[PDB]
């Protein structure tokens, strides 16, 4: 049928367009199908999409006459990246095959029962297990508990059909009693197929905040309890629904933080603010800067450092994302031979490239999205942008930039490097990410938002 | 293209301008048994000769048909080739 | 292999393989070679159920001649050699 295919498409696209209005958007880019089709156990809506397919388009004028066959396919439903999704009609066996199986199976059960009767034996209940779910009466029904009563229930079908008249609420399945007919279908396979159709848990959770809560592995996540509250939903998927590839929308930095909002998403502001309160952003910044200042304190010996002094920071610099300024500054006891800039993990450095005295550090926090969650690229982008720029002030045109995603709890540093630093910053940061009280205050507080417990 | 609700594979897609095709009289005239299928009747025909291949046109315009088939031949390669020169593309006569 | 998970045969895979055959002879050779591979090497694994899928699935292919039919010659019935 052409029209019912068209109407399935309009139907689903219409309900998706209803959740899209549920925030504010029609936008395709915000809502990749992972949002809708991931089962509840991963935190997605869990709707079952039968509308993708492709729809036979053949020959409007002739198909009024011949039934030309399928000569062409109109696109059923769309996406940014295609992926694929399984569709129900594949997971439910056709009627023919079930009636055939019913006939062969009930024949076989007739025989086997005649074996139990003639030989005065009892049904092994395993010998019948092969066909256990086959047959339109669904052999299992023989063995249900209440059968002794049900044989005195007759006329159930017509009663089911006349339940239309005596009560308001419809009963979408009016053609079977699961008591007499068993259960004629199953899905759960579909579930798994969707999870791996989107690329598996590992790619799916790239969309969520799962990396921000700090939990290393999925398996131990209980959620909290089957209906997901709306706020908790928009948080959980937020780094997609809020993303920097948005078609049209107006960048607005949140009040005291560095988060950018594209357009207006209704819940995301209340949830995000209630994550960042008591000026938690500043507390994070000054926390990290302070602790790095301690680890630089202890190491004055090896690195030949006259003074490690965190400057007096203009109050706003933590959440000001345009131009930054040095937090910690450095000073040379003897003098320093630095190298050309590199990533934290780039090994080979020729330290005789440059010779300077003062170095400086920055800690630039950023709350990242699913568009760009890659830090090191962002960090080199900043550092080059500022150091090339005239405005950004630094005591010497040599320094180190330290970036952090608080959303994915990732980090990196693109600096200028002289001997002894990288072995420090690597280990030290690897502690700090698990250390600071503040970042821990996030990682608990996001867990309050998303309502997650780690069991086991 | 617009009035006939047709597209050139690279051209724009518009609205029908006559939204109702739905009315169809059941009649012998166009019946399959009475038609001979030779050539598919691609759209580019219906845009090319709109009154002929296209049954019931409305608000259609005349396409301008043909031009002389320009033979123009020029040289952008050498600046010192003369202005009048016999180009190897031409036939030898 | 997917068709054996379906728990019952479906006209789906038949019309699929049929539309796939007629397009290019490489698929002819494909289904023939896989027929020999299945019947010869791989049958010993399948339980009597999945055999109900395979039987009909090749039945639809043979009876409509797409297979083609003489490729049934591989089958040989002997008490000595049979499964």
């Amino acid at each position: 049928t052409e029209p019912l295919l068209d109407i399935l498409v309009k139907g689903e696209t219409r309900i998706q367009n209803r959740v899209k209005l549920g925030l504010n958007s029609k936008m395709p880019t915000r809502f990749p199908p992972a949002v809708f089709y991931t089962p509840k156990e991963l935190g997605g809506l869990g709707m079952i999409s039968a509308s993708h397919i492709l729809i036979p388009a053949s020959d409007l004028s002739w198909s009024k006459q011949t039934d030309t066959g399928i000569t062409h396919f109109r696109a059923g439903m769309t996406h940014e990246d295609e992926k694929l999704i399984p569709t129900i009609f594949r997971y439910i066996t056709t009627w023919e095959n079930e009636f055939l199986d019913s006939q062969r199976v009930w024949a076989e059960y007739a025989t086997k029962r005649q074996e139990a009767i003639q030989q005065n034996r009892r049904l092994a209940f395993e010998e019948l297990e092969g066909s256990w779910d086959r047959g339109i009466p669904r052999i299992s029904t023989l063995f249900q508990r209440d059968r002794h009563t049900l044989a005195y229930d007759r006329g159930h079908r017509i009663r089911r059909e006349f339940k239309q008249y005596s009560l308001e609420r419809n009963s979408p399945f009016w053609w079977t009693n699961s008591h007499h007919d068993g259960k004629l279908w199953n899905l759960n396979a579909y579930r798994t197929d969707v999870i791996q159709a989107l690329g598996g848990i590992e790619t799916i959770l790239e969309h969520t905040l799962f990396k921000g809560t700090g939990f290393n592995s999925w398996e131990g996540l209980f959620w909290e309890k089957s209906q997901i509250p709306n706020r908790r939903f928009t948080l959980w998927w937020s780094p997609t629904i809020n993303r920097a590839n948005v078609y049209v929308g107006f960048l607005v930095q949140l009040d005291l933080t560095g988060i950018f909002l594209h357009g207006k998403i209704p819940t995301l502001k209340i949830s995000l603010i209630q994550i960042f309160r008591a000026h938690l952003w500043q507390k994070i910044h000054e926390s990290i800067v302070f602790d790095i200042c301690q680890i630089l304190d202890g190491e004055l010996d090896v690195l030949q450092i006259e003074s490690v002094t965190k400057e007096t920071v203009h109050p706003r610099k933590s959440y000001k994302m345009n131009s930054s300024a040095a937090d910690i500054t450095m000073e040379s006891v003897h003098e320093w031979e630095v190298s050309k800039p590199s990533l934290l993990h780039e090994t080979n450095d020729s330290f005789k490239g440059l010779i300077t005295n003062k170095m400086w550090f920055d800690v630039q926090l950023r709350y990242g999205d699913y568009d760009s969650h890659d830090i090191s690229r962002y960090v080199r982008a900043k550092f080059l942008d500022y150091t090339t720029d005239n405005v950004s002030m630094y005591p010497s045109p040599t320094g180190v930039m330290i970036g952090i995603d608080l959303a994915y709890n990732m980090y990196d540093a693109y600096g200028n490097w002289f001997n002894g630093l990288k072995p420090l910053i690597q280990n030290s940061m690897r502690t700090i990410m698990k250390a600071n009280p503040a970042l821990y205050v996030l990682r608990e507080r996001i867990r309050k938002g998303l309502q997650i417990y780690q069991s086991s | 293209g617009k009035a006939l609700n047709n597209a050139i594979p690279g051209g724009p897609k518009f609205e029908p301008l006559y939204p109702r095709e739905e009315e169809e009289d059941y009649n012998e005239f166009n019946s399959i048994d009475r038609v001979i299928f030779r050539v598919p009747i691609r759209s580019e025909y219906k845009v090319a000769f709109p009154h002929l291949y296209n049954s019931r046109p409305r608000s259609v315009r005349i396409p301008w048909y043909n031009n002389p088939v320009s033979c123009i031949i020029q040289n952008d390669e050498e600046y010192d080739t003369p202005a009048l020169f016999f180009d190897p593309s031409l036939n030898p006569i | 292999k997917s068709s054996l998970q379906e728990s019952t045969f479906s006209k789906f895979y038949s019309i699929l393989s049929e539309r796939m055959i007629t397009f290019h002879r490489s698929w002819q050779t494909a289904y023939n070679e896989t027929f020999e591979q299945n019947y010869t090497q791989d049958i010993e694994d399948y339980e009597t159920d999945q055999l109900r899928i395979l039987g009909k699935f090749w039945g639809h292919l043979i009876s409509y001649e797409f297979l083609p039919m003489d490729c049934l010659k591989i089958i040989k019935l002997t008490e000595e050699e049979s499964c």
């Binding site: 068209d6 498409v9 309009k10 696209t13 219409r14 729809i55 388009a57 053949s58 020959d59 409007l60 004028s61 066959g69 399928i70 000569t71 062409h72 396919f73 109109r74 696109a75 059923g76 439903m77 769309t78 | 609700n5 047709n6 597209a7 050139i8 594979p9 897609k13 518009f14 609205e15 029908p16 939204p19 095709e21 598919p40 691609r42 759209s43 580019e44 | 539309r19 007629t22 397009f23």
Partner: peptide, 27 residues
């Protein structure tokens, strides 16, 4: 080319109106 297949236009149909020949059935 639009041969008479596809939709009068893709507006209310929610799809992309993308049509493609069927490699399936030809000969």
């Amino acid at each position: 080319s639009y041969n008479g297949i596809g939709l009068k236009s893709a507006k209310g149909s929610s799809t992309s109106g993308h049509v493609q020949r069927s490699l399936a059935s030809n000969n």
